[PDB]
Paper text:
In this study we have designed and tested the properties of a new protein scaffold based on the OB-fold of the aspartyl tRNA synthetase (AspRS) from the thermophile Pyrobaculum aerophilum. We term these small, single-domain engineered binding proteins OBodies. To demonstrate the amenability of this new scaffold to engineering for new binding specificity, we developed a series of OBodies with increasing affinity to a model target protein, hen egg-white lysozyme (HEL).
Selections from the first affinity maturation library yielded the NL8 variants AM1L10 (KD = 5 µM) and AM1L200 (KD = 1 µM), representing 6- and 35-fold improvements in affinity over NL8, respectively. Analysis of the AM1L10 structure gave a clear rationale for the observed improvement in affinity: the substitution A56Y introduced a new hydrogen bond and increased buried surface area. However, analysis by the Robetta virtual alanine scanning server indicated that the predicted energetic contribution to binding by Y56 (ΔΔG = 0.86 kcal/mol) was not sufficient to completely account for the observed change in affinity. Comparison with the NL8-HEL structure showed a moderate rigid-body shift in the arrangement of the OBody-HEL interaction relative to the parent OBody NL8-HEL interface, constituting a rotation centred on R35 of approximately 10°. Residue K37 was re-selected to parental type, but the like-charge clash appeared to be ameliorated by a conformational shift in R61 away from the interface. The L4 residues remained predominantly disordered in the AM1L10 structure (residues D89, M90, H91 and N92 could not be resolved), suggesting that these residues were probably not involved in significant interactions with HEL, with the possible exception of pre-binding long-range electrostatic associations. Surprisingly, substitution P51S did not result in an appreciable structural change, which suggested that any advantage this substitution granted over parent-type may have been a manifestation of different dynamics at that position as well as surrounding residues. The crystal structure of the AM1L10-HEL complex at 1.95 Å revealed two major factors in the improvement in binding: the introduction of additional inter-domain contacts at Y56, and a consequent moderate shift in binding orientation compared to the NL8-HEL complex. Thus, the shift in binding orientation seen in AM1L10, and later in AM2EP06, can be viewed as an overall optimisation of bonding across the entire binding face, with the OBody “settling” on to the HEL ligand.
Residue numbers in the entry:
A (entry chain B): -1 to 88, 93 to 107
B (entry chain A): 1 to 129
Write the structure that this text describes.
């Protein structure tokens, strides 16, 4: 049986030196971006704090996660599990395996 | 129209893309290379019913209107067919909005996958600008 995971990291703890680490973040949707093949949800857990980027990319991100993305609104309360990926530009983002909506705004 | 590399670099500089939102000219040339292969007429249908249009492959869900995409927002306030002209004005204007949306050039998957973190200035090296 499925159960939403326990938060492992505050959004401010998501740093480039966590590249390759599986994390669970929890908070609210700060913003949404839909550019077609790339979609981005930003999650915050403090006011005036980080807004960590969670990216979805067609052909790489599981298609069921795009269905969850379509349900998302700003201020929704979410739990996201994924792998931290440090920016190639060298700042940080999350490649999700799970997106849970705990409540809609 | 299929632009050559340095031809596009000059056009993009003229249209004010160099350092727009902190992105040097090479980023934009590299993005166009891997999004459209420098082809202004490039169009590609996605599985979600949306289509990507032109030199910078702008998507029909949020950004341009192609009259066939459900949930069209048309934030660039432009027909998608206008993004297929040999003149890049319309694509540049819409690209400027897209890159200002809060995620910088991460809006372009080809830029993320082929340009981001590489020596992008190589794409404008040797060009008369």
């Amino acid at each position: 049986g499925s159960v939403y995971p326990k938060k492992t990291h505050w959004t401010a703890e998501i740093t480039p030196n966590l590249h390759g680490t599986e994390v669970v973040v929890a908070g609210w949707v700060a913003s949404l971006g839909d550019y077609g093949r790339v979609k981005i949800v930003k999650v915050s857990d403090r006011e005036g704090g980080a807004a960590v980027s969670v990216y979805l990319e067609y052909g790489k991100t599981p298609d069921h996660l795009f269905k969850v993305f379509a349900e998302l609104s700003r201020e929704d309360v979410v739990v996201i599990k994924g792998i931290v990926e440090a920016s190639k530009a060298a700042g940080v983002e999350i490649f999700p395996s799970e997106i849970w909506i705990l409540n809609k705004a | 129209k299929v632009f050559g590399r340095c031809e596009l670099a000059a056009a993009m500089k003229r249209h004010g893309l160099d350092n727009y939102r902190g992105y040097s000219l090479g980023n934009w040339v590299c993005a166009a290379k891997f999004e459209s292969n420098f082809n202004t007429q490039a169009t590609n249908r996605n599985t979600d019913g949306s289509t990507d249009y032109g030199i910078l492959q702008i998507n029909s869900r949020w950004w341009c209107n192609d009259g066939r995409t459900p949930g069209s927002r048309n934030l660039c306030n432009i027909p998608c067919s206008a993004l297929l002209s040999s003149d890049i004005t319309a694509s540049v204007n819409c690209a400027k909005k897209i890159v200002s949306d809060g995620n910088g050039m991460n809006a372009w998957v080809a830029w993320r996958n082929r340009c981001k973190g590489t020596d992008v200035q190589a794409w404008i090296r040797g060009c008369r600008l």
